[PDB]
Design a protein around this ligand. Sequence first.
Ligand SMILES: [Cl-]
Ligand SMILES: [Cl-]
Ligand SMILES: [Cl-]
Ligand SMILES: [Cl-]
Ligand SMILES: [Cl-]
Ligand SMILES: [Cl-]
Ligand SMILES: [K+]
Ligand SMILES: [K+]
Ligand SMILES: [K+]
Ligand SMILES: [K+]
Ligand SMILES: [K+]
Ligand SMILES: [K+]
Ligand SMILES: [Mg+2]
Ligand SMILES: [Mg+2]
Ligand SMILES: [Mg+2]
Ligand SMILES: [Mg+2]
Ligand SMILES: [Mg+2]
Ligand SMILES: [Mg+2]
Lengths: 333, 330, 333, 330, 333, 330
Amino acid sequence: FTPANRAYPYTRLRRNRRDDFSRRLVRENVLTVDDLILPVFVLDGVNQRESIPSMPGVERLSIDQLLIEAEEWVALGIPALALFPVTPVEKKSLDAAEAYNPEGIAQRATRALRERFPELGIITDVALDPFTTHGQDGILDDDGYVLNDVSIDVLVRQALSHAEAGAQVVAPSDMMDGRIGAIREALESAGHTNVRVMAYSAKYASAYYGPFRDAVGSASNLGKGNKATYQMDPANSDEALHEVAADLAEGADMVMVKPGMPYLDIVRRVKDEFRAPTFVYQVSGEYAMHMGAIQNGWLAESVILESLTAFKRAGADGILTYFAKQAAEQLRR
Amino acid sequence: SFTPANRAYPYTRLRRNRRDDFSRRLVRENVLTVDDLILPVFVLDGVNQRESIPSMPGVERLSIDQLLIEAEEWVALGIPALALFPVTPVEKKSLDAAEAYNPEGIAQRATRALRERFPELGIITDVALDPFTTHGQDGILDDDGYVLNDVSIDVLVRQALSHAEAGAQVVAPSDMMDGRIGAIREALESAGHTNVRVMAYSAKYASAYYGPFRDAVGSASGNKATYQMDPANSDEALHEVAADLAEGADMVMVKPGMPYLDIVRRVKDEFRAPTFVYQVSGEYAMHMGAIQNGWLAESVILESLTAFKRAGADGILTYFAKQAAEQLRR
Amino acid sequence: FTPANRAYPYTRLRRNRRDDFSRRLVRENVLTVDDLILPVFVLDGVNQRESIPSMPGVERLSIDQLLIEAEEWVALGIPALALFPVTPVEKKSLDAAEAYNPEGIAQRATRALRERFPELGIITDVALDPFTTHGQDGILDDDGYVLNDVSIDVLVRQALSHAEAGAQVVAPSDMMDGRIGAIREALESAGHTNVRVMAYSAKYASAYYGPFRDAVGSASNLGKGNKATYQMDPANSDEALHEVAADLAEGADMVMVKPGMPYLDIVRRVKDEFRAPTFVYQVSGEYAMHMGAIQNGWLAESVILESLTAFKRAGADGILTYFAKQAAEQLRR
Amino acid sequence: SFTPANRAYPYTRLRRNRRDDFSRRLVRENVLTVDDLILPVFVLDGVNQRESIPSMPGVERLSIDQLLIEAEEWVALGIPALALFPVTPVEKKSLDAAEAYNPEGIAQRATRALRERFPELGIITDVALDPFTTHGQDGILDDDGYVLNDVSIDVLVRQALSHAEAGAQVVAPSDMMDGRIGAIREALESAGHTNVRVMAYSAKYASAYYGPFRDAVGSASGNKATYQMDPANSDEALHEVAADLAEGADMVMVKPGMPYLDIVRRVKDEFRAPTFVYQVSGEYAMHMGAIQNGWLAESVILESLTAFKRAGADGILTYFAKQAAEQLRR
Amino acid sequence: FTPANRAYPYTRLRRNRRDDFSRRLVRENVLTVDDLILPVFVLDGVNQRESIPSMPGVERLSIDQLLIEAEEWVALGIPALALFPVTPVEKKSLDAAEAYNPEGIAQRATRALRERFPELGIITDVALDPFTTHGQDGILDDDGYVLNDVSIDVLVRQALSHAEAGAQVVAPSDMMDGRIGAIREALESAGHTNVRVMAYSAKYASAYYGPFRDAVGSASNLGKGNKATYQMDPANSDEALHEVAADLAEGADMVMVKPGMPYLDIVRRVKDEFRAPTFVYQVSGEYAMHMGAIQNGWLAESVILESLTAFKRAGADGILTYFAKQAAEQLRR
Amino acid sequence: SFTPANRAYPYTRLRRNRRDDFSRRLVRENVLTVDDLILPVFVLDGVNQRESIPSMPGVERLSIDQLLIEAEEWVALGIPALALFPVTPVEKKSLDAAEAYNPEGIAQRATRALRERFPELGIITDVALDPFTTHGQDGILDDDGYVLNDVSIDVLVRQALSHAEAGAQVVAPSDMMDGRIGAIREALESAGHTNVRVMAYSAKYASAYYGPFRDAVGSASGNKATYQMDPANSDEALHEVAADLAEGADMVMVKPGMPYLDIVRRVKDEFRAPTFVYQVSGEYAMHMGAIQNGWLAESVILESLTAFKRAGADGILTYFAKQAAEQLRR
Ligand SMILES: [Cl-]
Ligand SMILES: [Cl-]
Ligand SMILES: [Cl-]
Ligand SMILES: [Cl-]
Ligand SMILES: [Cl-]
Ligand SMILES: [Cl-]
Ligand SMILES: [K+]
Ligand SMILES: [K+]
Ligand SMILES: [K+]
Ligand SMILES: [K+]
Ligand SMILES: [K+]
Ligand SMILES: [K+]
Ligand SMILES: [Mg+2]
Ligand SMILES: [Mg+2]
Ligand SMILES: [Mg+2]
Ligand SMILES: [Mg+2]
Ligand SMILES: [Mg+2]
Ligand SMILES: [Mg+2]
């Protein structure tokens, strides 16, 4: 960068801050509804709405209830939903076969939403964690290690069942090496030419996933287990560039940094280095922490749009956020 | 900077994101909002007057009362700022351009009237001598017909001060005299006008695109290649901006607009400062003419304005600002 | 960039502007006839010259009339023509078979010009829009979507018929993914080793194509249809770099940004990043808008060379411009 | 800068290094140590006083004797520095903010007491007028309610000098007046306070995250968008830091912290200077609230602090500093 | 870099140096035990401990003695050992067959350590120099030249016997072209998916290897021979970038610069350019030279941590150092 | 900067160029020549004296007549410059370091004697107070034992002037006081010493490697972390060099040498200025000790010196300069 010899008092950076109109003129970034993705927790059955104690204001919804709520999500202009099925306990297995069940919640919810709301983007989740008795994102070997290439075999079948259900976007969150190219290849081979792959590229072994694990019901399955053999070390930044570079090479249409606010520097570096469609997840713990402080009267509602503007400023094109309705509503007005 | 990352067809198909509206909206790199818009307005001396301009279809010169009336609609649409260009009566032109610093000149009157009735509306005054000289040249001429640099700056400074006294939040020197940004900043600071912004017309080309504006303001009674920039020069625009930043400009502008998008892009990339671009009278008329003739669909207006945002402009001075602001509200 | 601490009054940038001679010495870019490509609209039949109301001063020309006009284009030193055939209504089809007809206007015009003017560069257009009843650049599926790889099959046959006719350059304007490498491969396989591919790399879904659509007669076919599923979003800049990077990798000899003046920042970035032979189209709407303002007395003729100098300054090596004769004439003198 | 080097699955499997603790530790790019930690502390006027703060669970305001007692534990843990924030009695607030430079103001007293009993402990004083004004604004107001720049700097300078006289090794201007770093540096040098460090709050955003701190210090009886930075602006933070470095800052700070990691990263990459970040009261409370509610595991605290190191911060002002220092000792 | 116009006396860089606390706050790099790899010389037989005259304080150790010493290495938190077997004279050959003996010292020591200390990283050495009668790192042709691809055949068999013994890391020190990709391929083919390859990427034809050659017993075998046809020319820096780029492309998980302190500029460039896990060897001559000066009373012990901090500052993530115990002990306290 | 160009085994085999001496010589990136060499020499007060130094095997302190005798051999070998380090008699040390600017101090005498008998030989004097203070500290101490910055600069300036008067072509301030390069340059210019070069010891670390030199010069009767650089810091060295260049240094130096090659590399890459590196007494002794012990072959000396050239140094201050110069002649 070139400072161009700017010096007080010839340069006073408060002059542009003097008035709202100049503030607005020079303002570098804005959040719009075109930046918003709403994740939703999807229940089996009919007429089901379940509160989540660790994500106040967020509800698990059966497919019929989801179709009704989606009327307003669409009316607000929200471009896409990311679906997270809440797997019945009895459907969890060692082999995660429910992942690719054409009658699984994810697949049924896709078919229903694609028919009801043809313009709404549906992003499915490619990962085994909602389907395994152990709560890990893949298949274990006899050492209890998440097998890479064997897991990809199952993830591929899943991705294909999502495309078959009409999902415009599949989002592998699993963090297996090479899964973007394996899923891309399979989609291509099968004629699913236009199904986007939204890679979770730099997805960290984070402590901020707690509430979501309660929400999808994987928390009791995982127990004290951790994902440090596949999810990325929080301390590592350069390594995120290698992750993204491979996912681009492998065919990803979009690349994602996960967690969001605790990793904004990663967003910045990924946008700067690759100049590709860049996505960020404002995860369940980020949401819970803001919502808990707002409900306590400790922070003003306005932190919501402040937290979301940060993602734009950092370089994200789109934001998966549990705040997406609240935000769209505030936008809107 | 830029890494292809070994992206290769068919693994990479750049049309997947284009497949649907929802994914095009998600990845869409830039968006024009009314926050980006500045409306230039031509201001008359009388009351209850509007005049049409043959080379600027749909643009009216307004007397100050009409300006106030119309500004109600501009403010309602959320347009942040106006850029005022006085249409000087012939009796008020001189070799000394004294009308430039007249506390009752059209720009000064318009400014006080606007600042009082719409206190949140940004007013950007024009610092230049071309509406005030008998030959309309942007400065004072010597005996060979040359536009004197430092002597013109003395008049421009008096002018900028009069604008700051009239209440203008921004003065915009468009004259292209060397060193004027610094001289104006110095004088503003010495006079205690600490918060008056200076929007430098930094890289302002010796263009053929200003023709309609010259009819608009009545300056059309000659070239400016000794002060305005040679259209061929790009590296040069970086030196012009570096100086204006060092001299204290709060925002820097590239002029003409669309014929110079590459300059917007270099200026934003290199300096990372508030960057402005003028979509000039000639751009406006070309587009407007083609639309009215039925040659071009009217969506070319948002396409042109969108181009400014993509090239790196923060704000756009454009005669389209009202039309664009209405399309963005609808 | 390094400002090197240059400060008024030690640095006065008006000193070089003082005199024509210093102006000329430091002037960074110049337009010459070596930068000019003339597009031409080519009619069937004999002795045909048709005015285009939305492109004043431009005529559709039968092949005999084109050969006569070309005498002066060559005398002026214009390096190349880009041919755009005006397809008879009765020859438009679903399958676009006329694209690869050895007796199609494009093919006949190539053979005639290559024989008459052996040094003149002939650039043919690879695209189905002049041949389809729907006016879209490729073959539609049952959803009315432009099929990518199926369209490339037809585009390849077309490119081959152009090479067979003697075209030194083929210019795929179609914006299908991967078509540069498919056309390159086919040309290579068939022994057309030296046929250049001039890729329309970063070709935007623009509103500035109106007059050309009237000129080639595709406007009534297209109707209200749009090309947003293949032509690029006007808002997108980083994405242009990915487009060009792939076309280079795929074998393009030249890469083109289209529209021209509304996308000069793209020209700048493409030249800066790739350092490759870079081309820009000053499209029909750009031409119409300048010509309409000049005829109205609103702009001086001099905007023509100003608009063309911009392309040089921005980084283009060559410019496809309907002004190419006027410009060459003004150069010339 | 960055070269992918044609790395491709399966030759490249980024999980191999993740396979085992030993290889994760070897390649681990960043590590938080107590060397990175600064504890902000809220200081009361009395003796034998502690108060709890509703919006800052687990944080106590301490009178100076309690501060000394607690500092024994902070020093033992190896915490390098405290950042003092006085809780000004209501009787001591004024329009002129004179209490700011009172040689017996809470900050000044706390500093002398600390410098004497823990001479190796770093004391960072707050240079700002918001704990001293009746309206708590960070400067002196004019008649339209505007925070006067240069007039406020005059008071900030008197304040910084009083801190240097009290023995402070670092004064930290948090006020966001233009040019204050230079004016403070000039005055420090003229007075022979050659080694007093200035830690500029350089890119300090007009944030909603300061709510709990305003309760903590008692300033909660209004916005600061005319001086604090617009949250949307990034390029702007580079200009703010460039000026503060030129003006003589020894370290530069980004504030808020985690909602601005991208700014930490740009600031460190571009300037390669000592870079500091404040994990503000709102960050602390959000995390603390979620942990106590059972929503988040307490390892999110080290994860947040680790994020600062990775983003490029050298030092972190954080209300978590004692907790983190104990986890690093255990 | 941007100096930002910093000028004395407004900028005095001694202000941060004034006090220990500010020193500590701004200190850019720190050595920790997570950066340390201990190389060890491994003897055949039982109850063997042999001093090395050119590496004072370093001992060759039989496997039983190595298991006992390793108790404290682990207690100190040292992440990994690099094993260097001391080949019996009678086991040296033309064909280096002992390299891949499942009962070779390296293989036996791996199996023993992997079983006794499951969390300790074991890095094996892939190179023929401890096994050849000539002391060169590969197989000679009839001109006495080290054959590239023939040597790789043997190195591959070795690497495989190391994986089979349970080594988590193999470190080819041989400097044959292409050996990283050959070893990677073989490991992959054989299902050794997670065995890391720590490439000696920019390994110089150095004079600083003397003491180690005495330690492993290769010095008398090598004689006056040199390795200039494979080990890198000390004068060459740009060439190191090409070396590393290829090893990354070929699948290395970590890349190493060798010697350490005489090549810190190489460390800096490799980290800066590639942003990959970067390793550096503080070689036997570096160790001997510091230890000799410390024992003579010519340098303070404190040069040890100074020499090791240099590697962190230069850009290394991990350091193979004979000082690793001393350092860990000093850390520790 | 760096493009791998898709080079891949077996098309690319980097050993082909290594196959033969002739191709290794052709591609060989750097070469040490005697043009790169500066010999530091320890100078005694007497006549007909040489002393051995226990921690610096093979290095002798020489009285000025012995220096002249030996310099005949250094000049013949083509060594461009000496760096003089006086061994001050105990009687000549003081709190005020006055012996530093004594026109008959050892450095000053040695310089006149050298400039007269070998007028083409470069003489680099040491600007520092550590050979002259009773506590040997590089400056004047205040009452807390702190090395005063500006007060020390006053003495260093007097010293540098005395060297310029004695005929020195280069004065080399090794003291690490802030701002000294500028103060020395100013004083040299004011006194008409227009062509006297200043070789700044710019990035001079608080090292353990200076131990043998302290025995050599007799300063060994304490640390310098308040002025010499923290070994851990790299970005910091860029700021140190930027200042010294701005202040007028003709060449900039990194000290210690081999433990800081990464700093040489950053300094040359970023500033592209004449860059010097000191291979310090501790480096010399480590190498020398290992060679004599039979542990290392003597080719490690050229390897170490070659490393400096590769890292980006133009010139090397090295106690090996005579040995290396003889190997380069043979
Ligand atoms: Cl599809
Ligand atoms: Cl003002
Ligand atoms: Cl051919
Ligand atoms: Cl001080
Ligand atoms: Cl394995
Ligand atoms: Cl001189
Ligand atoms: K978006
Ligand atoms: K804007
Ligand atoms: K020229
Ligand atoms: K630190
Ligand atoms: K490490
Ligand atoms: K050579
Ligand atoms: Mg991955
Ligand atoms: Mg200028
Ligand atoms: Mg393409
Ligand atoms: Mg500031
Ligand atoms: Mg190699
Ligand atoms: Mg210095």
